[PDB]
Amino acid sequence: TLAKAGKVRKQTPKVEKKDKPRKTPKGRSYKRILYNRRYAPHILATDPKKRKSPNWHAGKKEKMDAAA
Amino acid sequence: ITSSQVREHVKELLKYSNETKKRNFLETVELQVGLKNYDPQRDKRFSGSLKLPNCPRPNMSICIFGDAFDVDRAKSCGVDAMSVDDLKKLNKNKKLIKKLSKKYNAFIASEVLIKQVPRLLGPQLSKAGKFPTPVSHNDDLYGKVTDVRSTIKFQLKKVLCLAVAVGNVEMEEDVLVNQILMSVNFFVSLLKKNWQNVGSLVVKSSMGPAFRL
Amino acid sequence: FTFRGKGLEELTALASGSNSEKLISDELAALFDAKTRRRVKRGISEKYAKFVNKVRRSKEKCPAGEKPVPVKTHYRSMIVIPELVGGIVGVYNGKEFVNVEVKFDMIGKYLAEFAMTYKPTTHGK
Amino acid sequence: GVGKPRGIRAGRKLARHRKDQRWADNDFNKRLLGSRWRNPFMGASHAKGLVTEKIGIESKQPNSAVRKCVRVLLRKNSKKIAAFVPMDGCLNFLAENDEVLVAGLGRQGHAVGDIPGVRFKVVCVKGISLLALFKGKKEKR
RNA sequence: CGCGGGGUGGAGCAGCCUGGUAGCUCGUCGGGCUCAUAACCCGAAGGUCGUCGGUUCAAAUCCGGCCCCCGCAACCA
RNA sequence: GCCCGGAUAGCUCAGUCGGUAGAGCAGGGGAUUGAAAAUCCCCGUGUCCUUGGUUCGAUUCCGAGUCCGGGCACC
RNA sequence: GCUUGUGGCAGUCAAGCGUUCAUAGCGACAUUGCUUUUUGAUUCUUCGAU
RNA sequence: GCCAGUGAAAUA
RNA sequence: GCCCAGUGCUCUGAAUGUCAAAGUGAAGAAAUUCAACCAAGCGCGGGUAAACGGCGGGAGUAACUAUGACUCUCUUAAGGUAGCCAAAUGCCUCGUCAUCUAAUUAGUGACG
RNA sequence: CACCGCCCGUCGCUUGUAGUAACGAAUGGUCUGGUGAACCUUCUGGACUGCGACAGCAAUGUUGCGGAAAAAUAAGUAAACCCUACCAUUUGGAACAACAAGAAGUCGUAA
RNA sequence: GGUGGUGGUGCAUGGCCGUUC
RNA sequence: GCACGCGCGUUAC
RNA sequence: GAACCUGCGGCUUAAUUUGACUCAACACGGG
RNA sequence: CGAGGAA
RNA sequence: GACGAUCAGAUACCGUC
RNA sequence: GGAGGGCAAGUCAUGGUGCCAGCAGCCGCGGUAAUUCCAGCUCCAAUA
């Protein structure tokens, strides 16, 4: 073809991005948060064989609250 | 064998006897031959006397029949029967068509066949001794049975058969054998080529043989 | 020089006789085949009677200009009645209505017998 | 012993042998035979060119697809080039006759498994990085 | 013209010298078989035996007379 | 330069002793498949090259030009 | 060698082209002609030498 | 046998 | 290269048909006119082309387009094989593309 | 996806590719036979000028001597240019053809 | 936004059944 | 539904 | 092979509901 | 339809 | 190479030279 | 700059697309329920 150029993108409904509720700390802070959310002693505490996936929180509001 | 010896069958053979002098009563000679040996149908004869001259010699019941009116075509005389309800079952085959057409003379009946004669009635009988010949079949079978009883001449049909005559006791030679020939016409020759068509035969009178060929 | 079955008139007097009650007087009964007699002697419908009169008006009102008002019906089960002769009734078959001129001969026969219900087969391949 | 000779006096032998038996290496045989200089870029990493026309090419074996490609004319080299235009709408920016900057795809030789005889990528239109034209908030002319 | 050989389905070939039955192949037409596709196979339609007559119960069959076919032979004024 | 010739849809191509315009492929809608090829129905698309004449009307029958297309060019 | 159809070449009328205008430049139709390196007719001269 | 006779054609 | 049908040539070959003179038979009164057989030759059979010479033609026939190794065919021995060209053979032809020219109805190199 | 499996070649088609050799050109380099600017040196040449003696005290003049510009000269270094051969590096070229790859194209079936 | 649907996918599936037997 | 092509069968010569 | 019967294909038809296709479709969907 | 070809 | 046969095809697997 | 594997990180039953647009370093993704396309969200890696 040719005129069939970018058929896909043209057909895609432009969804918007969730305007940052607050902010995402960039610096030793981010590396800090990560350290806390995963390698902080409470997670290295429970079995190293039974600890969750750093993204099982695929953004699931139902399992998001069950954990916290 | 159509040679000088004809008068050896005739002249030299006319006083052979088998005892003494030569008797004291009348004579009885002839000249044997046939009819045409064809098949008693297609072609073998026509018309014209020789003669010859004779008739029966012994019996004459020949052949004449077809319908319920063909019986009276054999009542004031004597012939064979073709039957009515037989041409659709058994009036011809081998010893059947024979019966009616197989006597001695030939046939003097009429005609009536249709789509049946290529292997039955009219057929199986021809060279046997009959297959619809010329017997003026229209008024009956008597007037033309002058060609089927007496006089004659010598109607030669069916299976061989014929006649001959010239003199009495002794008075023939060149005209004795040449009387035997004279005792032959539409039976010794005829139209287109017919001076001979056989192999041999016989003859005498009462004496002994004739031609020793 | 042609005539008709049993006298078109004798029947109008036979059908509309002294007691022209039930569409098919017991008179006409003697005339029909067992199957038809069965039906009428059994239980014939009334609708079949109002349909009757619908032809009636169509046969008279129309001038001798021989232009009958086609009467439409699905009552393919109706058996032509004597007085039903002459009118052109439109009978449904499956697709549309069929207009048929009622002759004297089609009586005692089912009204459906003329409304072809299917087009037989032509061929080729 | 093995094939190789183990003499203290036979260094020369081993030496020449290695220099020889070494031609059996393509990587070697390649740069050694100034091959890199004969390709369309003349060794170069990138090349400028003018779009000769946007043509499309069909995918190979298990894939079936219309690939976006531009036939380019390299400047000092002056060769016909087959150049694959990257991401989605990309070819919608390449106007015929514009100036384009092309580079190879994974080691100069085999094209991406999918493509047929294409050995180049298109990175600039009129001197404007494609990626830039690909994301709205960046650039467009 | 004289000798001698021959016309049989639509085609090419049989049956004729040894009278009763008209066959083969192709082609046309239908069906098998197969898991299926080729292939392969079966079964049908179709001949007036050049044409006319004769023998004959019966003729493509033997016999003739014509009509073309081929081969020999040939002297026309 | 004279002698014939083709001009018809998106491209290759036929026409009662005029009165009507076509398959093919491109082609989009199907039937089909597991999806697809192939195949089978359907759509569509035009003064049938420009003029003059003949007729009720000409894409066609006529006449010239026209483009591209085979055969003829001191002594 | 006639003759000139056919070739070639000029000519009258002016409907037309020539965007405005018949003739600057050309001219349909229709019509008068010249030409004898086409070709075609014809058979006069020359096979009792071209 | 034959008047019956079928078949490619009937015989003592 | 392939063609033995054609014309020629040429072999013991063919189970059979012509085929002259003498010789034979038959018929007349002979002259004479009918016969049968009868060498070659012919015709039948085979080989034969570094023998004369020959060497076809039209239909269909997708993966824009034109296309033929495809098959269908009607067909006479055989249906041009290697090879080779606008050539001293090519009609149209001044063939088409190059090439040599400022320029080529010449040259040459190509292509069928 | 297991013989209704794999699979080979001719021809065709689809999508493509310009290699090796030769030749052409470009750049550079070398050889062969010539033409030869310029300049070092050389033999000349000697305007101009310095000195001494004589014609005058002086400008000027004669000659002897010395330095010395142009010109001209031979051998030499040798630029460029041409011709004759050869090398190197690049780059070029077409219908038909050719090569490359692929397939349930076509014909068969090799393995 | 449901009901209901012999409407579509048996290659989305249960259940069941045929086949290999 | 009928020009026809298949497959169980029913009735019979 | 025969005439009916019944199922499947095909071709018709307003429409001829549709499933199933070598045994492992076709008097089978109790059709 | 007169016992039915390849199967 | 010339022939027979086999095949749908055989200038091939058999056979005669 | 990524989130099927190699190669750290989504088992979202998310929206669009339907062998098309495109991805893909190599395996391979894609033919209507895509873990590789477009994009949202959440995650990972190195981090001026």
Side-chain angles (χ1 to χ4, degrees), chain C residues 5-7 10-15 24-37 79-83 104 107-109:
Chain C
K6 180 77 178 187
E10 170 190 52
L11 307 175
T12 308
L14 203 58
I24 308 172
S25 51
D26 310 295
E27 292 282 60
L28 295 173
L31 295 160
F32 303 81
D33 52 289
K35 278 275 186 153
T36 299
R37 293 165 41 186
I79 301 171
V80 199
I81 289 189
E83 286 95 308
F104 181 60
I107 306 179
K109 308 181 180 183

PDB file of all heavy atoms in Angstrom, chain C residues 5-7 10-15 24-37 79-83 104 107-109:
ATOM      1  N   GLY C   5     -72.367 -29.362 -15.794  1.00  0.00           N
ATOM      2  CA  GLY C   5     -72.609 -30.442 -14.848  1.00  0.00           C
ATOM      3  C   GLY C   5     -74.019 -30.863 -14.471  1.00  0.00           C
ATOM      4  O   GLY C   5     -74.553 -31.813 -15.055  1.00  0.00           O
ATOM      5  N   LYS C   6     -74.613 -30.170 -13.495  1.00  0.00           N
ATOM      6  CA  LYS C   6     -75.964 -30.491 -12.998  1.00  0.00           C
ATOM      7  C   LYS C   6     -76.988 -29.333 -13.047  1.00  0.00           C
ATOM      8  O   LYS C   6     -78.014 -29.369 -12.359  1.00  0.00           O
ATOM      9  CB  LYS C   6     -75.855 -31.025 -11.557  1.00  0.00           C
ATOM     10  CG  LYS C   6     -77.172 -31.405 -10.867  1.00  0.00           C
ATOM     11  CD  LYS C   6     -77.739 -32.735 -11.340  1.00  0.00           C
ATOM     12  CE  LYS C   6     -79.029 -33.082 -10.591  1.00  0.00           C
ATOM     13  NZ  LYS C   6     -79.558 -34.451 -10.898  1.00  0.00           N
ATOM     14  N   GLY C   7     -76.722 -28.316 -13.861  1.00  0.00           N
ATOM     15  CA  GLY C   7     -77.649 -27.200 -13.959  1.00  0.00           C
ATOM     16  C   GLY C   7     -77.356 -26.149 -12.912  1.00  0.00           C
ATOM     17  O   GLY C   7     -77.830 -26.240 -11.775  1.00  0.00           O
ATOM     18  N   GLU C  10     -80.515 -25.083 -10.869  1.00  0.00           N
ATOM     19  CA  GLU C  10     -81.123 -26.047  -9.957  1.00  0.00           C
ATOM     20  C   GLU C  10     -80.448 -25.953  -8.602  1.00  0.00           C
ATOM     21  O   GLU C  10     -81.091 -26.079  -7.559  1.00  0.00           O
ATOM     22  CB  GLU C  10     -80.966 -27.478 -10.481  1.00  0.00           C
ATOM     23  CG  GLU C  10     -81.359 -28.534  -9.446  1.00  0.00           C
ATOM     24  CD  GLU C  10     -80.990 -29.943  -9.859  1.00  0.00           C
ATOM     25  OE1 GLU C  10     -79.814 -30.173 -10.209  1.00  0.00           O
ATOM     26  OE2 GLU C  10     -81.874 -30.825  -9.824  1.00  0.00           O
ATOM     27  N   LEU C  11     -79.139 -25.732  -8.643  1.00  0.00           N
ATOM     28  CA  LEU C  11     -78.316 -25.635  -7.445  1.00  0.00           C
ATOM     29  C   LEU C  11     -78.502 -24.332  -6.655  1.00  0.00           C
ATOM     30  O   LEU C  11     -78.445 -24.335  -5.425  1.00  0.00           O
ATOM     31  CB  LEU C  11     -76.848 -25.833  -7.839  1.00  0.00           C
ATOM     32  CG  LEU C  11     -76.615 -27.120  -8.651  1.00  0.00           C
ATOM     33  CD1 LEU C  11     -75.166 -27.206  -9.109  1.00  0.00           C
ATOM     34  CD2 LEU C  11     -76.985 -28.332  -7.806  1.00  0.00           C
ATOM     35  N   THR C  12     -78.716 -23.222  -7.350  1.00  0.00           N
ATOM     36  CA  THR C  12     -78.924 -21.961  -6.654  1.00  0.00           C
ATOM     37  C   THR C  12     -80.209 -22.085  -5.846  1.00  0.00           C
ATOM     38  O   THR C  12     -80.384 -21.405  -4.834  1.00  0.00           O
ATOM     39  CB  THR C  12     -79.071 -20.783  -7.629  1.00  0.00           C
ATOM     40  OG1 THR C  12     -77.970 -20.776  -8.546  1.00  0.00           O
ATOM     41  CG2 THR C  12     -79.096 -19.465  -6.858  1.00  0.00           C
ATOM     42  N   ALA C  13     -81.098 -22.958  -6.318  1.00  0.00           N
ATOM     43  CA  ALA C  13     -82.389 -23.228  -5.679  1.00  0.00           C
ATOM     44  C   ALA C  13     -82.191 -24.362  -4.684  1.00  0.00           C
ATOM     45  O   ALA C  13     -82.924 -24.500  -3.701  1.00  0.00           O
ATOM     46  CB  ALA C  13     -83.426 -23.627  -6.729  1.00  0.00           C
ATOM     47  N   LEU C  14     -81.206 -25.194  -4.992  1.00  0.00           N
ATOM     48  CA  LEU C  14     -80.844 -26.323  -4.158  1.00  0.00           C
ATOM     49  C   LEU C  14     -80.097 -25.819  -2.923  1.00  0.00           C
ATOM     50  O   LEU C  14     -80.341 -26.284  -1.808  1.00  0.00           O
ATOM     51  CB  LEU C  14     -79.960 -27.276  -4.957  1.00  0.00           C
ATOM     52  CG  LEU C  14     -79.908 -28.730  -4.502  1.00  0.00           C
ATOM     53  CD1 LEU C  14     -81.318 -29.308  -4.517  1.00  0.00           C
ATOM     54  CD2 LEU C  14     -78.990 -29.515  -5.427  1.00  0.00           C
ATOM     55  N   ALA C  15     -79.185 -24.869  -3.138  1.00  0.00           N
ATOM     56  CA  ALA C  15     -78.384 -24.282  -2.065  1.00  0.00           C
ATOM     57  C   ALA C  15     -79.176 -23.263  -1.244  1.00  0.00           C
ATOM     58  O   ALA C  15     -79.194 -23.325  -0.012  1.00  0.00           O
ATOM     59  CB  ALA C  15     -77.139 -23.625  -2.652  1.00  0.00           C
ATOM     60  N   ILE C  24     -73.920 -24.827   3.110  1.00  0.00           N
ATOM     61  CA  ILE C  24     -74.083 -26.024   2.313  1.00  0.00           C
ATOM     62  C   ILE C  24     -75.269 -26.830   2.790  1.00  0.00           C
ATOM     63  O   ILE C  24     -75.138 -27.712   3.636  1.00  0.00           O
ATOM     64  CB  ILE C  24     -72.829 -26.888   2.379  1.00  0.00           C
ATOM     65  CG1 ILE C  24     -71.611 -26.028   2.042  1.00  0.00           C
ATOM     66  CG2 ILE C  24     -72.950 -28.059   1.414  1.00  0.00           C
ATOM     67  CD1 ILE C  24     -70.292 -26.724   2.250  1.00  0.00           C
ATOM     68  N   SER C  25     -76.434 -26.507   2.251  1.00  0.00           N
ATOM     69  CA  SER C  25     -77.647 -27.215   2.605  1.00  0.00           C
ATOM     70  C   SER C  25     -77.376 -28.700   2.423  1.00  0.00           C
ATOM     71  O   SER C  25     -76.542 -29.091   1.605  1.00  0.00           O
ATOM     72  CB  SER C  25     -78.784 -26.776   1.689  1.00  0.00           C
ATOM     73  OG  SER C  25     -78.390 -26.866   0.330  1.00  0.00           O
ATOM     74  N   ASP C  26     -78.079 -29.522   3.191  1.00  0.00           N
ATOM     75  CA  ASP C  26     -77.916 -30.967   3.116  1.00  0.00           C
ATOM     76  C   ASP C  26     -78.152 -31.460   1.693  1.00  0.00           C
ATOM     77  O   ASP C  26     -77.870 -32.614   1.366  1.00  0.00           O
ATOM     78  CB  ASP C  26     -78.890 -31.633   4.079  1.00  0.00           C
ATOM     79  CG  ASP C  26     -78.825 -31.029   5.460  1.00  0.00           C
ATOM     80  OD1 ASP C  26     -77.768 -31.160   6.110  1.00  0.00           O
ATOM     81  OD2 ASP C  26     -79.821 -30.410   5.886  1.00  0.00           O
ATOM     82  N   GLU C  27     -78.680 -30.571   0.853  1.00  0.00           N
ATOM     83  CA  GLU C  27     -78.945 -30.884  -0.547  1.00  0.00           C
ATOM     84  C   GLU C  27     -77.602 -31.072  -1.223  1.00  0.00           C
ATOM     85  O   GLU C  27     -77.271 -32.161  -1.689  1.00  0.00           O
ATOM     86  CB  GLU C  27     -79.681 -29.730  -1.229  1.00  0.00           C
ATOM     87  CG  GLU C  27     -81.106 -29.487  -0.744  1.00  0.00           C
ATOM     88  CD  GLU C  27     -82.109 -30.478  -1.314  1.00  0.00           C
ATOM     89  OE1 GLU C  27     -81.950 -31.696  -1.083  1.00  0.00           O
ATOM     90  OE2 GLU C  27     -83.061 -30.033  -1.995  1.00  0.00           O
ATOM     91  N   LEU C  28     -76.834 -29.988  -1.270  1.00  0.00           N
ATOM     92  CA  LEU C  28     -75.515 -30.007  -1.875  1.00  0.00           C
ATOM     93  C   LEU C  28     -74.715 -31.172  -1.311  1.00  0.00           C
ATOM     94  O   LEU C  28     -73.805 -31.683  -1.961  1.00  0.00           O
ATOM     95  CB  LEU C  28     -74.785 -28.703  -1.571  1.00  0.00           C
ATOM     96  CG  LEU C  28     -75.386 -27.438  -2.170  1.00  0.00           C
ATOM     97  CD1 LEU C  28     -74.642 -26.208  -1.643  1.00  0.00           C
ATOM     98  CD2 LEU C  28     -75.308 -27.527  -3.689  1.00  0.00           C
ATOM     99  N   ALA C  29     -75.080 -31.608  -0.108  1.00  0.00           N
ATOM    100  CA  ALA C  29     -74.388 -32.713   0.541  1.00  0.00           C
ATOM    101  C   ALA C  29     -74.373 -33.953  -0.356  1.00  0.00           C
ATOM    102  O   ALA C  29     -73.317 -34.526  -0.616  1.00  0.00           O
ATOM    103  CB  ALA C  29     -75.065 -33.037   1.876  1.00  0.00           C
ATOM    104  N   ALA C  30     -75.542 -34.337  -0.855  1.00  0.00           N
ATOM    105  CA  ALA C  30     -75.674 -35.514  -1.711  1.00  0.00           C
ATOM    106  C   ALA C  30     -74.734 -35.464  -2.911  1.00  0.00           C
ATOM    107  O   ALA C  30     -74.382 -36.497  -3.479  1.00  0.00           O
ATOM    108  CB  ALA C  30     -77.116 -35.646  -2.196  1.00  0.00           C
ATOM    109  N   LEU C  31     -74.343 -34.256  -3.293  1.00  0.00           N
ATOM    110  CA  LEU C  31     -73.472 -34.038  -4.439  1.00  0.00           C
ATOM    111  C   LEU C  31     -71.967 -34.221  -4.234  1.00  0.00           C
ATOM    112  O   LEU C  31     -71.288 -34.773  -5.103  1.00  0.00           O
ATOM    113  CB  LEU C  31     -73.736 -32.641  -4.993  1.00  0.00           C
ATOM    114  CG  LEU C  31     -75.140 -32.437  -5.561  1.00  0.00           C
ATOM    115  CD1 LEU C  31     -75.466 -30.949  -5.632  1.00  0.00           C
ATOM    116  CD2 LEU C  31     -75.219 -33.107  -6.932  1.00  0.00           C
ATOM    117  N   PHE C  32     -71.450 -33.765  -3.095  1.00  0.00           N
ATOM    118  CA  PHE C  32     -70.016 -33.848  -2.816  1.00  0.00           C
ATOM    119  C   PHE C  32     -69.434 -35.204  -2.434  1.00  0.00           C
ATOM    120  O   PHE C  32     -70.134 -36.092  -1.942  1.00  0.00           O
ATOM    121  CB  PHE C  32     -69.632 -32.851  -1.733  1.00  0.00           C
ATOM    122  CG  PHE C  32     -69.978 -31.439  -2.069  1.00  0.00           C
ATOM    123  CD1 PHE C  32     -71.268 -30.970  -1.887  1.00  0.00           C
ATOM    124  CD2 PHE C  32     -69.014 -30.575  -2.573  1.00  0.00           C
ATOM    125  CE1 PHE C  32     -71.602 -29.655  -2.201  1.00  0.00           C
ATOM    126  CE2 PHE C  32     -69.334 -29.250  -2.892  1.00  0.00           C
ATOM    127  CZ  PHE C  32     -70.631 -28.791  -2.707  1.00  0.00           C
ATOM    128  N   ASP C  33     -68.129 -35.336  -2.663  1.00  0.00           N
ATOM    129  CA  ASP C  33     -67.381 -36.546  -2.350  1.00  0.00           C
ATOM    130  C   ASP C  33     -67.386 -36.741  -0.841  1.00  0.00           C
ATOM    131  O   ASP C  33     -67.647 -35.801  -0.089  1.00  0.00           O
ATOM    132  CB  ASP C  33     -65.941 -36.403  -2.835  1.00  0.00           C
ATOM    133  CG  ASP C  33     -65.284 -35.124  -2.330  1.00  0.00           C
ATOM    134  OD1 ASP C  33     -65.655 -34.030  -2.811  1.00  0.00           O
ATOM    135  OD2 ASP C  33     -64.404 -35.209  -1.447  1.00  0.00           O
ATOM    136  N   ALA C  34     -67.088 -37.958  -0.404  1.00  0.00           N
ATOM    137  CA  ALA C  34     -67.068 -38.278   1.021  1.00  0.00           C
ATOM    138  C   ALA C  34     -66.243 -37.302   1.874  1.00  0.00           C
ATOM    139  O   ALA C  34     -66.707 -36.859   2.929  1.00  0.00           O
ATOM    140  CB  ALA C  34     -66.567 -39.711   1.225  1.00  0.00           C
ATOM    141  N   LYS C  35     -65.032 -36.973   1.420  1.00  0.00           N
ATOM    142  CA  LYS C  35     -64.146 -36.062   2.157  1.00  0.00           C
ATOM    143  C   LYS C  35     -64.798 -34.711   2.430  1.00  0.00           C
ATOM    144  O   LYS C  35     -64.733 -34.188   3.548  1.00  0.00           O
ATOM    145  CB  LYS C  35     -62.828 -35.848   1.394  1.00  0.00           C
ATOM    146  CG  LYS C  35     -61.780 -36.950   1.600  1.00  0.00           C
ATOM    147  CD  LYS C  35     -60.933 -36.740   2.862  1.00  0.00           C
ATOM    148  CE  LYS C  35     -59.821 -37.779   2.954  1.00  0.00           C
ATOM    149  NZ  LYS C  35     -58.666 -37.257   3.731  1.00  0.00           N
ATOM    150  N   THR C  36     -65.438 -34.153   1.411  1.00  0.00           N
ATOM    151  CA  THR C  36     -66.102 -32.873   1.565  1.00  0.00           C
ATOM    152  C   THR C  36     -67.302 -33.022   2.513  1.00  0.00           C
ATOM    153  O   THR C  36     -67.446 -32.251   3.467  1.00  0.00           O
ATOM    154  CB  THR C  36     -66.572 -32.355   0.200  1.00  0.00           C
ATOM    155  OG1 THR C  36     -65.438 -32.166  -0.658  1.00  0.00           O
ATOM    156  CG2 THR C  36     -67.307 -31.051   0.364  1.00  0.00           C
ATOM    157  N   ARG C  37     -68.142 -34.028   2.247  1.00  0.00           N
ATOM    158  CA  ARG C  37     -69.332 -34.321   3.057  1.00  0.00           C
ATOM    159  C   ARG C  37     -68.936 -34.478   4.501  1.00  0.00           C
ATOM    160  O   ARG C  37     -69.644 -34.054   5.411  1.00  0.00           O
ATOM    161  CB  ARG C  37     -69.985 -35.619   2.598  1.00  0.00           C
ATOM    162  CG  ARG C  37     -70.592 -35.558   1.216  1.00  0.00           C
ATOM    163  CD  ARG C  37     -70.876 -36.949   0.718  1.00  0.00           C
ATOM    164  NE  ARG C  37     -71.421 -37.781   1.782  1.00  0.00           N
ATOM    165  CZ  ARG C  37     -71.655 -39.080   1.659  1.00  0.00           C
ATOM    166  NH1 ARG C  37     -71.391 -39.691   0.512  1.00  0.00           N
ATOM    167  NH2 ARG C  37     -72.143 -39.770   2.682  1.00  0.00           N
ATOM    168  N   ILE C  79     -64.176 -25.163   0.149  1.00  0.00           N
ATOM    169  CA  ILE C  79     -64.612 -25.963  -0.991  1.00  0.00           C
ATOM    170  C   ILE C  79     -65.648 -25.131  -1.726  1.00  0.00           C
ATOM    171  O   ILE C  79     -66.731 -24.868  -1.199  1.00  0.00           O
ATOM    172  CB  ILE C  79     -65.261 -27.282  -0.539  1.00  0.00           C
ATOM    173  CG1 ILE C  79     -64.252 -28.082   0.289  1.00  0.00           C
ATOM    174  CG2 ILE C  79     -65.735 -28.076  -1.756  1.00  0.00           C
ATOM    175  CD1 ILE C  79     -64.821 -29.310   0.977  1.00  0.00           C
ATOM    176  N   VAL C  80     -65.309 -24.719  -2.941  1.00  0.00           N
ATOM    177  CA  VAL C  80     -66.188 -23.886  -3.751  1.00  0.00           C
ATOM    178  C   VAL C  80     -67.666 -24.272  -3.669  1.00  0.00           C
ATOM    179  O   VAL C  80     -68.038 -25.431  -3.901  1.00  0.00           O
ATOM    180  CB  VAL C  80     -65.757 -23.910  -5.230  1.00  0.00           C
ATOM    181  CG1 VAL C  80     -66.352 -22.724  -5.966  1.00  0.00           C
ATOM    182  CG2 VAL C  80     -64.250 -23.889  -5.321  1.00  0.00           C
ATOM    183  N   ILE C  81     -68.490 -23.283  -3.324  1.00  0.00           N
ATOM    184  CA  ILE C  81     -69.939 -23.464  -3.226  1.00  0.00           C
ATOM    185  C   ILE C  81     -70.544 -22.983  -4.556  1.00  0.00           C
ATOM    186  O   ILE C  81     -70.022 -22.053  -5.179  1.00  0.00           O
ATOM    187  CB  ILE C  81     -70.528 -22.658  -2.017  1.00  0.00           C
ATOM    188  CG1 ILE C  81     -70.091 -23.312  -0.704  1.00  0.00           C
ATOM    189  CG2 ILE C  81     -72.059 -22.620  -2.076  1.00  0.00           C
ATOM    190  CD1 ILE C  81     -70.774 -22.751   0.517  1.00  0.00           C
ATOM    191  N   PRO C  82     -71.651 -23.610  -5.008  1.00  0.00           N
ATOM    192  CA  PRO C  82     -72.299 -23.230  -6.269  1.00  0.00           C
ATOM    193  C   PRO C  82     -72.366 -21.731  -6.538  1.00  0.00           C
ATOM    194  O   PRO C  82     -71.931 -21.256  -7.590  1.00  0.00           O
ATOM    195  CB  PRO C  82     -73.686 -23.847  -6.129  1.00  0.00           C
ATOM    196  CG  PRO C  82     -73.388 -25.123  -5.433  1.00  0.00           C
ATOM    197  CD  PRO C  82     -72.402 -24.704  -4.354  1.00  0.00           C
ATOM    198  N   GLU C  83     -72.897 -20.991  -5.571  1.00  0.00           N
ATOM    199  CA  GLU C  83     -73.039 -19.548  -5.699  1.00  0.00           C
ATOM    200  C   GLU C  83     -71.694 -18.823  -5.770  1.00  0.00           C
ATOM    201  O   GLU C  83     -71.642 -17.612  -5.985  1.00  0.00           O
ATOM    202  CB  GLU C  83     -73.884 -18.996  -4.537  1.00  0.00           C
ATOM    203  CG  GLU C  83     -75.394 -19.291  -4.631  1.00  0.00           C
ATOM    204  CD  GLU C  83     -75.830 -20.536  -3.863  1.00  0.00           C
ATOM    205  OE1 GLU C  83     -75.235 -21.619  -4.062  1.00  0.00           O
ATOM    206  OE2 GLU C  83     -76.788 -20.425  -3.064  1.00  0.00           O
ATOM    207  N   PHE C 104     -67.796 -23.150 -13.430  1.00  0.00           N
ATOM    208  CA  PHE C 104     -68.734 -24.100 -12.857  1.00  0.00           C
ATOM    209  C   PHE C 104     -68.033 -25.386 -12.435  1.00  0.00           C
ATOM    210  O   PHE C 104     -68.391 -25.982 -11.421  1.00  0.00           O
ATOM    211  CB  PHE C 104     -69.832 -24.427 -13.873  1.00  0.00           C
ATOM    212  CG  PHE C 104     -70.869 -25.398 -13.364  1.00  0.00           C
ATOM    213  CD1 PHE C 104     -71.639 -25.098 -12.244  1.00  0.00           C
ATOM    214  CD2 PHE C 104     -71.083 -26.611 -14.013  1.00  0.00           C
ATOM    215  CE1 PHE C 104     -72.608 -25.996 -11.778  1.00  0.00           C
ATOM    216  CE2 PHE C 104     -72.050 -27.512 -13.555  1.00  0.00           C
ATOM    217  CZ  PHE C 104     -72.811 -27.204 -12.438  1.00  0.00           C
ATOM    218  N   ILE C 107     -66.260 -26.649  -8.608  1.00  0.00           N
ATOM    219  CA  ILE C 107     -67.074 -26.756  -7.403  1.00  0.00           C
ATOM    220  C   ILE C 107     -66.849 -28.127  -6.784  1.00  0.00           C
ATOM    221  O   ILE C 107     -66.525 -29.096  -7.490  1.00  0.00           O
ATOM    222  CB  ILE C 107     -68.576 -26.607  -7.705  1.00  0.00           C
ATOM    223  CG1 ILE C 107     -68.826 -25.297  -8.462  1.00  0.00           C
ATOM    224  CG2 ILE C 107     -69.368 -26.645  -6.394  1.00  0.00           C
ATOM    225  CD1 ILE C 107     -70.287 -25.055  -8.848  1.00  0.00           C
ATOM    226  N   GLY C 108     -67.013 -28.204  -5.464  1.00  0.00           N
ATOM    227  CA  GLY C 108     -66.821 -29.463  -4.769  1.00  0.00           C
ATOM    228  C   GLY C 108     -65.345 -29.745  -4.615  1.00  0.00           C
ATOM    229  O   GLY C 108     -64.938 -30.718  -3.977  1.00  0.00           O
ATOM    230  N   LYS C 109     -64.549 -28.877  -5.225  1.00  0.00           N
ATOM    231  CA  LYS C 109     -63.100 -28.977  -5.193  1.00  0.00           C
ATOM    232  C   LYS C 109     -62.563 -27.891  -4.282  1.00  0.00           C
ATOM    233  O   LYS C 109     -63.165 -26.823  -4.162  1.00  0.00           O
ATOM    234  CB  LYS C 109     -62.558 -28.831  -6.609  1.00  0.00           C
ATOM    235  CG  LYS C 109     -63.257 -29.783  -7.565  1.00  0.00           C
ATOM    236  CD  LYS C 109     -62.744 -29.683  -8.981  1.00  0.00           C
ATOM    237  CE  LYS C 109     -63.494 -30.656  -9.873  1.00  0.00           C
ATOM    238  NZ  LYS C 109     -62.958 -30.632 -11.254  1.00  0.00           N
TER     239      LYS C 109
END
